[PDB]
């Protein structure tokens, strides 16, 4: 009973450790999956928006510069 529970909980600990590793790696996969290309696309479209603002900003600069 004593050594029984010892080995049992020891195996539970090892299993739980492997489970933690699995969840951890799952989060790792999620980030490495497509989050980086997603934000790259976001920044790309944002860059396009800056090209949009590149025109009208000139007029505001002109207003400041008379």
């Amino acid at each position: 009973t004593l050594t029984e529970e010892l080995e049992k909980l020891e195996q539970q600990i090892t299993l739980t450790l492997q489970e933690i590793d699995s969840n951890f790696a799952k989060a790792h996969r999620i980030v490495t999956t497509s989050i980086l290309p997603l934000v790259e696309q976001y920044g790309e479209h944002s860059r396009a928006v800056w090209e949009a603002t590149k025109f009208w900003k000139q007029f505001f600069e002109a207003s400041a510069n008379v």
Binding site: F55, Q58, F59, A62, S63, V66
Partner: protein, 59 residues
């Protein structure tokens, strides 16, 4: 000198209408100057949209 008397009276009549028109144009010229004085807000505005049309032939 009858026609000379007519000449004198008629040149004076001409002078009357002449000066009359002078006074008219003077009050009018004041209106003109006032109009343009109110209208001089088109320097920077015109320059702004001049830059607009300039950048149309830029990109």
């Amino acid at each position: 000198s009858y026609f000379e008397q007519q000449r004198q009276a008629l040149i004076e009549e001409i002078a009357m209408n002449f000066e009359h028109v002078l006074a008219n144009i003077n009050k009018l010229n004041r209106s003109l100057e006032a109009v343009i004085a109110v209208g001089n807000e088109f320097s920077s505005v015109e320059a702004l949209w001049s830059q607009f049309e300039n950048v149309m032939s830029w990109s």
